[PDB]
Amino acid sequence: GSSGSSGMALARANSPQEALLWALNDLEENSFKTLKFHLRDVTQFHLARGELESLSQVDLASKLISMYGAQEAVRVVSRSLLAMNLMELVDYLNQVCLNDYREIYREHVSGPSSG
């Protein structure tokens, strides 16, 4: 088959939200249909009785961030992807993940909270 071009980042977005929403849309009908059920295996929540099915490409992207966030939502989908054998997607999500905090005693530079 031979695959590849040059880079990896398909859609060059400016936020983790788009990186996650695109990952759900990129999934096929056979992959998403199976990945949807795998969600409960990772979430282990009470999302049943017409809850899991209620989710979607958009609802899932909003729920994943509302329940955890944009930085954590990307780590979750990546953990489930390994089960479905899809390094292609795992490499994409892994590339998008803003989170670098060094020291927690005198970590002062400007104000990573409001400013």
Curated annotation (Swiss-Prot):
- In which compartments does the protein localize? Cytoplasm; Cell membrane
| Reported consequences of knocking out the gene | High susceptibility to systemic infection by C.albicans with 100% mortality by day 16 post-infection. Does not alter Nlrp3 inflammasome activity and up-regulates Gdpd3 expression. Does not impair skin repair after wounding. Also does not impair the irritant contact dermatitis response following treatment with the irritant croton oil. Significantly reduced inflammation in dinitrofluorobenzene-induced contact hypersensitivity response with reduced numbers of CD3(+), CD8(+) and CD4(+) T cells.
Which intervals hold domain Pyrin? 8-99
User: In terms of domain of life, where is this protein from?
Assistant: Eukaryota
Q: In which tissues is it expressed?
A: Expressed in skin, tongue, heart, colon and several cell lines of hematopoietic and myocytic origin but not in kidney, skeletal muscle, spleen, liver, lung, thymus, brain or small intestine (at protein level).
Whom does it interact with, and what assembly results? Answer: Oligomerizes. Interacts with PYCARD. Also interacts with CASP1 and IL1B. Interacts with NOD1 and components of the NOD1 signaling pathway including RIPK2, NR2C2/TAK1 and IKBKG/NEMO.
Its domain description in UniProt is:
The pyrin and ATP-binding domains are required to elicit cytokine release following bacterial infection. The NACHT domain is required for inhibition of CASP1 autoprocessing.
The family classification in the record reads: Belongs to the NLRP family.
Role, per record: Inhibits autoprocessing of CASP1, CASP1-dependent IL1B secretion, PYCARD aggregation and PYCARD-mediated apoptosis but not apoptosis induced by FAS or BID. Displays anti-inflammatory activity. Required for immunity against C.albicans infection. Involved in the innate immune response by contributing to pro-inflammatory cytokine release in response to invasive bacterial infection. Contributes to T-cell-mediated inflammatory responses in the skin.
| Protein name in UniProt | NACHT, LRR and PYD domains-containing protein 10
Q: Which residues of the full protein are shown?
A: 1 to 102 of 673
